Amino acid sequence: WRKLIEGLRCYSERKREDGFWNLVCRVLKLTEDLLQTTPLNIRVKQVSVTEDEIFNNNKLRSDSWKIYDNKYRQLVSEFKKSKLVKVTPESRLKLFELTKFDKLPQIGEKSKRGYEFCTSCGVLPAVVIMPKEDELEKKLIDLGIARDEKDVRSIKNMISPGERLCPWCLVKRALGAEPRLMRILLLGDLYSVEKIVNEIVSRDVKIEIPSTSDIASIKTFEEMIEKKNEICEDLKEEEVCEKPSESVLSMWQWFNKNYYNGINLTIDPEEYWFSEKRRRYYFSVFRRHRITFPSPYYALVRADSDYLGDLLEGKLTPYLAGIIDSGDYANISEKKEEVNKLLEEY
RNA sequence: GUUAAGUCUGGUUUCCCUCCAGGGUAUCUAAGUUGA
Ligand SMILES: Nc1ncnc2c1ncn2[C@@H]1O[C@H](COP(=O)(O)OP(=O)(O)NP(=O)(O)O)[C@@H](O)[C@H]1O
Numbered sequence: 308w309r310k311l312i313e314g315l316r317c318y319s320e321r322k323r324e325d326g327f328w329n330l331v332c333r334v335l336k337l338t339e340d341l342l343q344t345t346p347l348n349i350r351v352k353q354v355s356v357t358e359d360e361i362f363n364n365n366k367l368r369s370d371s372w373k374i375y376d377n378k379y380r381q382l383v384s385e386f387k388k389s390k391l392v393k394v395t396p397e398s399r400l401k402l403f404e405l406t407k408f409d410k411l412p413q414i415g416e417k418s419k420r421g422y423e424f425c426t427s428c429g430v431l432p433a434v435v436i437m438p439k440e441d442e443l444e445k446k447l448i449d450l451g452i453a454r455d456e457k458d459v460r461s462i463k464n465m466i467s468p469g470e471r472l473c474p475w476c477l478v479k480r481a482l483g484a485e486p487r488l489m490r491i492l493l494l495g496d497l498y499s500v501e502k503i504v505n506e507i508v509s510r511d512v513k514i515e516i517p518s519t520s521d522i523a524s525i526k527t528f529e530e531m532i533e534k535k536n537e538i539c540e541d542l543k544e545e546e547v548c549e550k551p552s553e554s555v556l557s558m559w560q561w562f563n564k565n566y567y568n569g570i571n572l573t574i575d576p577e578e579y580w581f582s583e584k585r586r587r588y589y590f591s592v593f594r595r596h597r598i599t600f601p602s603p604y605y606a607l608v609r610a611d612s613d614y615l616g617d618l619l620e621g622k623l624t625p626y627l628a629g630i631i632d633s634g635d636y637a638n639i640s641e642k643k644e645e646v647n648k649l650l651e652e653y
Numbered sequence: 654g655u656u657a658a659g660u661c662u663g664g665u666u667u668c669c670c671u672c673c674a675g676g677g678u679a680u681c682u683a684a685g686u687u688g689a
Pocket residue numbers: 611612613614615616617619620
């Protein structure tokens with residue numbers, strides 16, 4: 308964790324320009340002793356086994372073959388018991404004096420109620436406060452966020468107006484800027500923390516991670532690219548149907564397979580057809596072309612396997628989900644019938 | 654044995670509808686949340 312955060316500090320210092328990287332530098336130096344703590348605690352449990360348990364002093368044993376199914380179950384038992392207490396990674400930090408006594412670095416705006424809460428985190432206090440979208444430059448510059456007019460556009464590119472950030476979620480934004488710093492962790496033990504920063508600052512590559520606006524507007528984009536110029540001549544002006552300037556690629560397969568198809572997929576729908584100053588013009592444009600105006604909804608599809616824990620424990624609740632409860636194993640003498648049937652079949 | 658003269662009456666009374674069928678079958682509805 309600390310190798311990643313320090314490699315991030317060095318990669319950001321390699322870019323004292325671009326505003327956002329400069330703000331990241333400026334607030335990292337103020338929050339180290341808070342950013343020392345990892346944002347994600349781990350639980351580690353071990354289980355021991357010796358030759359007293361496996362061998363009759365020269366060979367294997369009988370009930371030695373079952374020694375794994377016993378130690379694995381001991382391990383999972385202690386995991387289950389320790390999961391009875393959840394401690395959150397925020398409880399580890401020392402903030403009493405930093406909040407009671409104003410000590411927090413408030414680079415950005417200043418709260419009129421002590422400190423702000425992170426909009427991305429919810430619980431941690433905010434370090435980088437962004438003014439609301441009414442007049443930014445005339446504030447972003449007299450405050451400490453930006454230095455010029457050119458650097459606001461790059462700060463405003465990652466931190467929307469109004470986004471308060473805690474050190475952890477701000478570091479998350481920083482990593483999201485270019486997610487190639489992950490090789491500090493992805494490899495580890497293999498290259499220096501500086502080999503990688505040099506490699507990244509050498510071959511500059513920008514990535515476009517899709518927002519919920521991009522997902523909601525998928526079929527709209529798709530229906531604009533089957534009218535490549537037949538819709539472009541109408542606009543021809545607002546960079547929606549203009550050249551791919553750089554060679555930006557991304558992990559979104561649909562974005563990656565549909566980029567060189569006339570329409571610039573890296574526009575923000577919150578700017579064009581989800582905006583409040585535009586989108587009437589865009590309603591007209593889509594009306595004039597048989598374009599189904601986009602819905603603001605997307606699908607968050609989650610899925611988890613059923614009883615894979617018990618399955619690794621060789622239980623039968625995976626096999627009979629609902630019939631055999633997990634609690635039915637405490638005294639399995641009751642449901643002898645279904646287990647007998649299916650186990651014998653198998 | 655003879656004379657005369659016809660006169661009275663001018664269809665009534667019942668029954669005027671009874672019984673059964675008083676709707677049956679088929680369709681019972683089909684076809685068709687979007688933007689801030
Ligand atoms: N024996 C195991 N080895 C490795 N990972 C495990 C093991 N048991 C659980 N996990 C993972 O650690 C987490 C434990 O969550 P948990 O939900 O209890 O697992 P589970 O077996 O899937 N129970 P459930 O998902 O409710 O059916 C999940 O991310 C599991 O994928």
